[PDB]
Each structure stands twice: as C-alpha cells, then as structure tokens.
Amino acid sequence: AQDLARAIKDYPNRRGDVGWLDFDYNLPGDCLSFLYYRQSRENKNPSDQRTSMLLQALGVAESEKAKNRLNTELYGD
Amino acid sequence: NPQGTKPNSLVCANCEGEGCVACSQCKGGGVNLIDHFNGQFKAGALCWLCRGKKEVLCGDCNGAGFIGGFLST
Amino acid sequence: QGTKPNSLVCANCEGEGCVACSQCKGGGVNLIDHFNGQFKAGALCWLCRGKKEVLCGDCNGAGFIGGFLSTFD
Amino acid sequence: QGTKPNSLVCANCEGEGCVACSQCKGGGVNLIDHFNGQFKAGALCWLCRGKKEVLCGDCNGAGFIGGFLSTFD
Amino acid sequence: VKDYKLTYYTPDYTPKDTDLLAAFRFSPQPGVPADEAGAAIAAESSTGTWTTVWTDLLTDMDRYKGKCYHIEPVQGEENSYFAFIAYPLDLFEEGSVTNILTSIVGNVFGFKAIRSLRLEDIRFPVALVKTFQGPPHGIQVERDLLNKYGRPMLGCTIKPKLGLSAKNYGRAVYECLRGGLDFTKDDENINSQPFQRWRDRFLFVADAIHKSQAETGEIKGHYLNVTAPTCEEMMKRAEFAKELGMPIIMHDFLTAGFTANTTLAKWCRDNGVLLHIHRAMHAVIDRQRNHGIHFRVLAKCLRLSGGDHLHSGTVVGKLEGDKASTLGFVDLMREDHIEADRSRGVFFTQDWASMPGVLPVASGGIHVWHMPALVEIFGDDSVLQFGGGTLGHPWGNAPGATANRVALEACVQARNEGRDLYREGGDILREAGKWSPELAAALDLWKEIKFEFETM
Amino acid sequence: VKDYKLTYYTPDYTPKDTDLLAAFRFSPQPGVPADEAGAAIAAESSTGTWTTVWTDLLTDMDRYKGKCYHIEPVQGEENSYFAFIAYPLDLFEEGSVTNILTSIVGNVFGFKAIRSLRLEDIRFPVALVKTFQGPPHGIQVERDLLNKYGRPMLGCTIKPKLGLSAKNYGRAVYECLRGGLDFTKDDENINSQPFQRWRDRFLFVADAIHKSQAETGEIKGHYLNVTAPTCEEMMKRAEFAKELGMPIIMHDFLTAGFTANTTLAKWCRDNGVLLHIHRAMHAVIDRQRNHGIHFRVLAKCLRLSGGDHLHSGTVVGKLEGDKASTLGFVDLMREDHIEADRSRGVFFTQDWASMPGVLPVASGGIHVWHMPALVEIFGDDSVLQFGGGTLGHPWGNAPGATANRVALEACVQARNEGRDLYREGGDILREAGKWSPELAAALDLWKEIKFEF
Amino acid sequence: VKDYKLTYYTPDYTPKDTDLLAAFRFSPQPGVPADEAGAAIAAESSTGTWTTVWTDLLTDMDRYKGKCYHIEPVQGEENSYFAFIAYPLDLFEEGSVTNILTSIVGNVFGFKAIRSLRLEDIRFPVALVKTFQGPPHGIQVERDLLNKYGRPMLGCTIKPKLGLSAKNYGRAVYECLRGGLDFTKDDENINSQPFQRWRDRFLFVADAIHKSQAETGEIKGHYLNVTAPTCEEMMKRAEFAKELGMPIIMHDFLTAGFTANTTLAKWCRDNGVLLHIHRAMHAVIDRQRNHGIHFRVLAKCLRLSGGDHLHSGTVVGKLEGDKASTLGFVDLMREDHIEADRSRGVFFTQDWASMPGVLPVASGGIHVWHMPALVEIFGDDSVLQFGGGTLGHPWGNAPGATANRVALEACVQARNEGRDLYREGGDILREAGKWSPELAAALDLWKEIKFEFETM
Q1: E159 is catalytic
Q2: Which of C34, E298, F94, G377 is 20 to 30 Å from G439 by CA-CA measure?
C-alpha cells in the first residue's frame, strides 16, 4: 500500500518520458505498472533483471493500451 | 494429538491448520445468545467470549495450527 | 591386534607392555660388532644398552589395543 | 612525453614498461671489458646482469605519462 | 593387564568418602567381555595404560588411578551394563567445573571397543562441594527478597511475537505485569539484533516495571537476557541492568559455557541480583537413551556452578517411567540429603552440606486446566511459566493474567483445606469460575484433560 | 490460508546470497510424512507457528521465518531424508556465534514427531563472514613468525604428566626441545591441581625454552594451558604467559564455551600470541550418526570465532568415505573457496572472503613408519603430534626427537625429488637410517612397517 | 597499455555483488581520448601502473585492480563523460570511512591529463554495509523516545543573536520551548568563547528545559554543541551533558572530521543520546557542477558513520532540475531499497540491509506560508527549523512558537481528510487564522507565495 501510494503520487511529475501517456491516471494499477515499466527500462536487454520487472508490471496493469505496449516491449518488436 | 484427515505431522484436526476458529457462542451478528448476571454482554449485541470478533484461537493447538512438539503457543 | 575373545589385551606382549629386547634377546650384549663400529660385540647391546627390555611396538607399552588414549592410530 | 593523439601512452617503450637493455642490446653479455675490470666482455652485461631488459627511463616502468601516481615529476 | 585381574577392576574395593564416583551405562562391541570394557573405561578416564612402564619410575603410581569397583547388567536390555568407577580427589582443581567435565568425559566417549556410552550419575564428595560457591541466593533468600510466601510464582514468556518494536515490547510487558503476574521472560533468541537493540529494550522494560510495581503494590520483575558475544559485552549489559534497578537477569549455560556462567554467578553474588538459567541446546546431548550425558548430571553441575532458577520441564504428560526420573532430579536440586533409590534414577547417596537449593521452572504449553496438577506435584517452591495460556485470552493481555492468578489462588486455597486435587480439580475450577468473567472465558476456551481414571 | 499448503515448504524458492542455509538429516516417527516433517523443522527453529494469528498483528511477518525448500531422500538408508532450510539474515546478530547456535539448534532437537535429527552442514553468507574477527593470525603470518618453511611442524605430547613435579617437567621439556622438535604440548587435563600449580610450572617451562632456543638456534615453543574456572583467572594466566615471553597458548573451546573462546581470541590478536585449540569433549556430541552435530559445523564455527591450530585426528587408517570425509573438511580450514562435492561431505559452496586459514593437527600415537603417508596427505601446512613415538625410544628423549626429525626431513626431500612417498616409504626410511643410529633403533622398535597395498 | 585494450577498460565485464562501484563525471584535456582517460582514472585510484613490471613477481596482482567497465557521454554537454569503475572488496578496511575516502578520492583528483573530475555516486555492497554501526538510534526508536507521532517536529535556531550572556540565552530558550516548539538549536559558531563559556551555557539551558517540560507535559530538547579542539575536551562536554539529563547533542562532521564523528557516534550508542549532524563547510566541496564531490556521497558516508538528523536543505524554491536531485537523495537516506533512476540522480541500485534511516532537517528562512508545501514534500518523517519565522513575531518569542504550532497542526489535520495542499494552502491557513490572534498576526506580515500556476 505504501509503495502504491508513492507511485501514484510520483506519476504526475514525469510529464515527459518514454510511453507516459499510454498509462492512464485514473486507475491505480496503471500507475503502478508505469512505475515498474520505467524502472525496468533503466537497464539493458534482458539480463533476467529487466524481464522480471516487465513481468511484474504486466501482472498488475488493468488497461488495454498498457497491455499491448508491455507486450510490444517484452515479446517481439 | 489430533491429525487432520489422513495421518500427517498432526496438523491439528480441531481447526485443520486454521489456528483461529469460529467462536462457539456467536451467530451472524457476533451476538451473545447467553444471558448472564454480570450483564456486560447479556443484553445482546456483543458476544461474551469473542467480544464481536466472531473467532477465537483453537483450544487444541492454541493457534499454532499444528501439534507434535509445539502444542505450546 | 588383540587376543580375540578379550579384544583389548595386546597379543604381542600379552599385556606386559615391556618385552625382552629383540636385538640382544634379553642378553644385554651385542651379538655382533656393528658396521659403524660404535657398538661392539660382547660389550653392550646397541638398542637397549644392557637393560634387556624395550617397549612393545604394537601397544607402545600400554597393553592396550585400540584405546583412544595411547596407540589410537 | 606520450604518443600525442593518445597522450598518456609512453612514447619511448610504447606501453611495455620494461625495454630491451640499452647496454647489451638484449644480448645479456658485455660488449666490452670495463675499465674497472669488474665487468668483462662476453661474461655478463654490467647493467642488467643477463636479464636482457631494464625499466624504461621515461615512465620508470609504469607505461604512464603524467600520472599523479608514478612519474608525476 | 592379563588374566591377572587388570589392576583396575577391583571388586573387593570399597570407596572412601573423598572419592568421586561415576556410573556409566555402556554397550560393547561384539566379541568383547564386560569386565575388560569396564577396566578400559577406567583406564581411559585417567592415565591411559594398564601396565607400569611409563607411570612408575620412583613412586608416581597408584595415586592418580581410577579403579573400577562394580559391574552389573541392566534389567530388560541385553548386551548393556552398568559400570561404577571411582576417582581420587587429587585429580581435580578446586572450584572449576570445566576441569571435572574434561577429566571424566574428556576422551572416553570416543573409545573404539565400546559401541555406546552414557553417563548416568555422579557423586561429589563434601570436601569438593565446599570449594564451589553455589547459587548466589538460593530458595529462602530468593523468597524473602520478593516477599512472596505460600504460593508458587507465575510468569509469562512472550514467545510467538517477533520483530516487535522496543516500545510495543514494553507495552505488552506492562499489560502482563499489571494484570497480576509476577515475572516475565524474554525470548531466548532475542539479543541485540538490528530490529531491536539491547539498550532500548532494557530502557522500556524498566519503565514498564516501575509503573506497574508502583501502581500495584508488590514487586515485579522481568528476566533480561544478558547473553553476549564476549565477557566484556556481557558484563556491560549486566552493569547497565543493575543500574536501572532490575532484580533478576537471565543466561544460557550451555551455548555460552561454564566459564561465563561461573563469572556471571560471582558477579551476581557480589551485586545482589538473582540469576535465572535457561537450558537451551540440551537435547543435543541428552535425548537418546543410549549415548550422551543424562540431564541430572548437568543439573548437579549447575547447582555447583551457580544459578537460582532452572528449567526442568513439566511432568503432566508423562508416564511413571519418566515422571519418576523427573521427580527424582527435582528432589536432587531442592533438598539437602538424598538417599539412593534406583526407581527414581538416583544411583548414589548425595549430601549437599547446607548449600542452598535451586528453584524448578515448569513451562511450555500449559493452561488453566493443568493448575490443579502442577500445584501438588511440583509443590510451593516452583515457578510456573505460561507461554500461550496467557497471551491468547479472548479479550486481551491483562485479563489473561487475571484469569491465571485467580485459578492459582483458588487451587492453593483449596489444597490448604485438605481437599484432594486429583479427584476435585475440575469442580474446584468451575466453582471458582462463577464470580469472575475472566476465569469463565478462560475455562471455556481450553479443554479439560481428565488425567487418568480418577487420579495421577 | 488452510494448512494443506504448509506455506513453509516452498519447493521452487531459490535462496538468496544473504540467506543462511542449513542441511539436516532426519528420520521421522512411524506414520508421519516427509514434507510435513520438513515444514515442522523449519517452523520449530523459527517462529513456531504455521498460521498467522499472532505474527500478523499489524501486517508484518514472513520475513523472520525459515522455509524448507528441498527434501531429497538418502541413498542406501531407508526412512531417513535430507532437508534444506534457508534463514533470513536479520535474525542473527553480528560477531556472536552463540546466537547462531541458539537460533538454529535450540529446541528443534527436542521435537517429538521425529525419531532422530542430525545437522550436517551450514553456509554462512559473506555478509555475515565479514563481521567476525576470524583467526588471530592465520597460516602465512604464523609461518613467518616462527620462520619455518617447506615442511610440516613437529610436536610432542608429554605422557607421564601425573604426579610429576614442576622441575622434572621442565627438564623433560628441555630434553625434547633440544633434540630437534618444534612444539611441546601440555596435557589437556593439567591446570592447577594441588600437586602442581600453574605459576610454578609456567616458570620452569619458560626457563627450559630460553635455554634450548639459543643452543638449538631454532624458535621453540610449548603450548601452555590457560583454561581456567573464570574470565579473571583465564586473563591472569594469559597475561603472565605473555610477560614471560611465550609465543603460543592453549584452550578448550567445547568445555569452556564460545564466549570465553571469543574473548581469548580478541586478546591474542591484540597482543601477538598464537592460539591452539584443543577439541576435548567432542565425541559426546558428534560420534553417533543418528543424532548430534557433525564436526565440520563446529570446525566452521571455530574458524569464525578464532583459533590458529585445530586438532583433526589422523586419517591413515580410516576405510573410505569415512576417510574422504575428513579430507573434506580439512579443505574447509585452509582453502578459501570450496565447491560443493557431496562425495566428500561438502553440501554447499562456501566462499570465505579472504579470511585467513587454520592449521590442522594430526595426533594419535603415530610413529616413524607413518611419516610418508602423513607427509603426503596433509601436505606441508600441518603439525604432527607424537605421543609415545618420541618418549619411548630406548635411549631417551633427545634421541627420539632426533629420530623423528631425521625421518621427517628425509621424507620431505624425497618427495621434492618426486619419489612416491607411499610406494617407497619403507625404502626411504631404510636408506636414511643407515648413517644414523637413532633412526635405526626407531625403525626396529616400531616393527610396524605398515604395508601400503 | 598499448593498442591492446589497456587491461583496465574491460567493457565485457560485469561486476560481482561484492564490488564497490563508483561513477565519475570527467572532462579531459584537448587531444586525449575518452577510453584512455577512463582507464587512467582506474589506474590512479589503485596501483598506479598499466603494465606488470612491479606488480607481478609470483601472483600478487590482477586482484587489487580497479577495472573500468563503462564509459558514456553526458547528454547536453560536450567533451564530458561518465565513467563507471569497480573496485574489489579486499582493498578496504572493515569499519572505517577514512580508508574508503582516501582510497577512492585519494590522489586521482590531481591527475594532469584530466581537466576536471566529479564523483557523482557510489555503491557499497551489503557485505561492507554490515561492518559499520550506522546511526545510533534511527527513525522509529528516535520517534519512540520522544513520543511524537503523526506530525513532523518543529525547531527554532537562535541565529542572529551573538554576544548574549548565558542567562538571557537560557531565558530565550525557555520562552521558545514553553510556547509550543519541540527542539531548539545552538548557533554553530558558538563554542566556549570568552563572552560565553560552555559550562555556563549548558547549566542554564538545562534549567530552562526542565522548567518548561515540567509545566507543559511533553518532552523538550536543545541541541547542545559539543564540537571541541580535542578528543578529550569533546568527550568531557558530552559526559557533562549526559549528566544533566539531556536527550540530544550536536556536532559538525566536516570540520571536525570522520574519526571524531565515528567516536562520538559510538559513545552516543553506548549512552543513549541522539546525535544531530550539522553540515557546515560543505559548499567548499560540492557547489560547482564540474569539480568536487556531490553531496549524496557524503550523505551515504554519514548514514554509515553515524548520525540521526541531517541537514538537507529545503526545496520550496528550486526547479525540477534540482528539486528532483534533492528528493532523490532524501529517499536515499530514509528507505531500505532504492532503485536506479537517473532523473533523480540515483545511478546504482542500493540495498541497505535493514540499517536504520536518518531524519532530514529542512531549514533556512522559512515562514508560515510555506507550511502547506513542506508538510507534503518531505512527508511527516522530517524536522522543520524556523530561524527568523519565529523570533520575529510582532509581540514576542512564545507567541511566535504558538503561531507556528497552530499552522502546522492545521495543515496536517487538513491533509489527512484528503484536501489538497497545492490548491488549498492559503485558504486552509486563512480559515485557521480566525480563532487565534497569533496566527493572524503572523499571516499578516509574512507574505503569500503562490508557488506556481496552481500546483508545485
């Protein structure tokens, strides 16, 4: 709950980023998914440490643009 | 040494591992069926034993969920 | 080693611990002049210097076979 | 010193740190008998005693030009 | 030595009153007699020879030698014997338990011709008892310091909870002590660990003790655990605990050793605190019935080294094959003269020379329906620890303490008037649980036990 | 939430690099399964509950509990299994090994639903290895302190210790050390008995050391037993042994405890003394296979708390498996990184983070005919203690010393040439004994040629 | 070394979890590549050679060697790069910050071929974190000792006065503490100087603390400055301050050093006082953006060495280019696991192994109209120092404290119910400043700020 609230409050001040407007604001799962996705992107190709965080992000998102974007990322260009 | 279902390391049968169990004297509203002279819970809304929480610890395992060596705590 | 039915007792010395010197055979004098010449025949036995006994090698004088203390090996 | 585009790498040894001995030219034997006579021709090189290398003077063996640690000067 | 009777197995020998006797139960390898094995156990615990090739030059012989004076077979078991052997008094240092241990059980337990070896008892002469200090205070002084007469004392460990903040720890201790208990015990795994360092725990526990004792009117305590990595750290914890004004501390005498326990007992004797000993890591030594060191030996060594309370384990759930042994070594550490009786495990007659006694602590998953039994079995001089039977009351910490207090006083007051506690335990508790809701709730949560047909 | 799950047997859980792993071999009562017994061992040695009715007071647990994660069975034996358990790092405090012992092997051994339980190995993370002091000196530092390179060291134990006055004790020590030995050892159960007090013995032993040192030209030593009844007396004995100028002392870490051993190790580091650890009273704990604590666990705990030498017992006459086991943990006392090889008892991969080593000591009445074997099994990083193999020579103590010395250096030289020590051991010993009378007397006395297949 | 890739710049190398990583931002001289400058920074921080002419005789090398495993360019700036290099664990002493500093930044900052060098971050492994002690108490214990839950704490330095007697000092401290503040801080230039020696100051401050705390009912404090010329003088001041019963002391960790700060932190841990660290003389090291040591490195080194409060500076008046960095570093010293994120300046993922946190102190010319912002930027785990916003109230010292207290409680009470603190700061304060003349007067002179369009 603490990390969820912190991610929700951190979301607004990332106005410019990679794929920011594909995660909506009025859903908590998508805020948390954006946190995980941005934390994973701060890495290089898999190394089994980026894929873990992408799979964590996919297990909590609840929109559809979030889902097809994270699928574009984790599985196939 | 209660064992739930088939023999195991005595997961206590009285609760089947729940540790907590439903309290005996509250039905639905955590109400007290019992009426007693003290009257604190006699009137109705609050169950005397669990004070409305609707569960207690299991008496056989004391909430541990298993017996064997650790009947204790 | 050991005598068998009573395993502990040494079989080479039968518990004596000391044994007759195997070089001079208990005589206390050298049978032959040594090649080095330090020890000469009919003077003193080279190994025991006349005492006519040594410690038994198997038990190192303990009379014990397999004791944790003494000849544990 | 240094090679220029890559300034740090030593220019005299090209990073080797050690270099062929300049006295015996890597032969390990003295070219000439010394005036003192302690060192003689065809025996051992006076400077390196046969090892056929020394440390490069410019970098004192570091392969570094201008390093604060080693050859700071 | 040879067919000559080994000079170590001397059955015609009767021991002096200044000899340390020891009784081993051994089982030998196939093809080895019993007498030879007895004499070999006698020779391993001392000079490791049967002959005189080393140990005789002028007179150095027959003075530092452990004769073996009795061997008999165990009834029931086959290929299993008792060997009684007897050591002189000049082999042992004056005032050291480490030396006695490392001289008896030093390297005999690794003898190859023996299949298994157990040390069942031991007898210290009075001449050796009087060189040790003993418990700091004892039973009578320990009862007079706290001013608790008649009844046994109550305590409540806080074991299930883990990771507690120091302040919530102090809070739970306060709620227990205020409700009507006497002591309270730290979990024995709790030392200074990153979630709860020691000085904060000591501070908040001391504050709780002062508050509850001031607003109740009697003397309360809390066993603070001073087990440490070094002699310096341990003495530092103990000094700080005395500064705050604490009556009692705690220690672990098997993982920390006997040197540290002796040091701490001398400090406690100088500075006037009581010492509670916690037997941890003991089943590693005395669980299997065919190898190790039975626990009554360690109880004696602790009465010698130092300690006022000792964990001895309950007997409510055992048969008379082990209830007997536990009652035996509970008498071995309270009285002053114990006569030899093999049914209760006591092998030798031991006289303690007016050294004080220790106090047995009965613990581990007990609740109110056991209080009738424990009261008579262990007697007035016992401490009763309630792990879960207190903290789990349906509505709090203080009510659970009140319930246990009421039950205890009911049982003891009833025993004073001649009523039986085997026939009339349940009805005593039920008659008491009528003018108090706490005891009623407690009786309803747990379940009656019905010891046996009508007694025991 | 129901316990059919057991929430403690997590077979897919992989353990972190900051978890302390433990491997038990247990055998359960008739009628109890294996995985339940593994979960029960994990719960007994932690918060003793499977449920969450206490710990979940305010959403805070599942980080102070161990969890079983592998319950393979044992080959050959039936009704006995292995159980691996992983404990978090924030359960133990730093620098304290009593806390580790109390937290793992506390009450678990008293569990009722198992017949027998033994603790076979343990793995300390580097995060936890780095907070202990370790050996005071190590191996390199002590070879440099004593100035002895390229061969084992030689020691003798004094067997007619009882009823021997302090001065005759000193004279025997002088005779042995003068012949060519390096160390003499004080018997384990000689502290302060009325026939021979300790100050009166430290005096004469120091005198003998000083005399022989100069004449031999070698740095000599005698392990002086400082095991005392209290912390105070122990410290007094150690301070006096330092004032005299002694280079090494002795202790018993299983009767005196771990608190006293850690205190002594810190003192010895601060004051430049070496420490030799004697392992009395060990078979009480680790002889029988069914129950106890295997000795390699105690060797690891010792390397952590402190100690420079450690008794380990000969390996010449063990059969196999039981022999390859011993060699196993010798490598857990000298090597810094040890890979998992279950054939040699090592269960987990252990990395020691550049903490010094410990020196094995082989003891047990060995004689000269054993010199080849030992010299090639333990290598050159060890001490060899001789009992009757030195004091029983027909000529005296100094001849026995020179005999053992000659045999050892002969074996070492041939090994340098590459002659196989085991194959040519009888031959190597025979040729050396030709120009030396002492070695010839010894060869004959100890008739045990000890055939080598 | 040569065209051979230098044996120090190994881009295919991935570091182990027991390596200390460091990230430098460097700018090289004209005519020097980037890879060679990276490898040279790697060779200067360790053995100062590229070759093996010294450091290879038998084995002793290629271990104590700082490989450089990454180099990249900085975005925006030209001729400016980031170099990530990685040191082994065997180079560093166990428990010493001095050694880590003098091994990393020892003599690399004087390299000639580099035009400028900055140390931006650092990553300690867990194996090294666990050999230091850390803060004496932390956040939770420090909150439990004082019994202040929910809100952030208030304090008021007495800065502009200098040359006051000791008694008037005690008087002002009393007026401030009685009115409703919690702490009060000494000016950091105040040591024993001829107009005001230290023992007199300590005496009168202690008397004021006792009076106000007795007649108010909660726990008050005052950061006494124990910075001294020597280890002896400093320990003497600290012992006397403990004797009077003071909860908290103060120190300067950059002019006094790290040896004195470690010593004082161990004393505070033994004796149970809290330590407040004051960062003075820091802009000498970390102001210019192209040379020095960024401050987050020193914040980490202080969390390791010891300290409970730390000055971090406000963010009310910065842009998101530096507000981000300050928030990033603030999280680096409160939490327990921080993920790599370059927008907030965190370069590496740092895990703190359940070591406690420190507490950020926000100070320097702030007044009531800032209270809405601070309360929701720092959260409620922080301390707020009011230099002039308290002592300058139109009619005294105690009314100013009352005004600040009222404003703080209004803002926090409002925050919990869900009301925004960016849209509704001003009207919250105005609605609160209606039943209290003090807050009305304070709102009068101090002006509203109007952060931005409507938020941030």
Answers
A1: yes
A2: G377
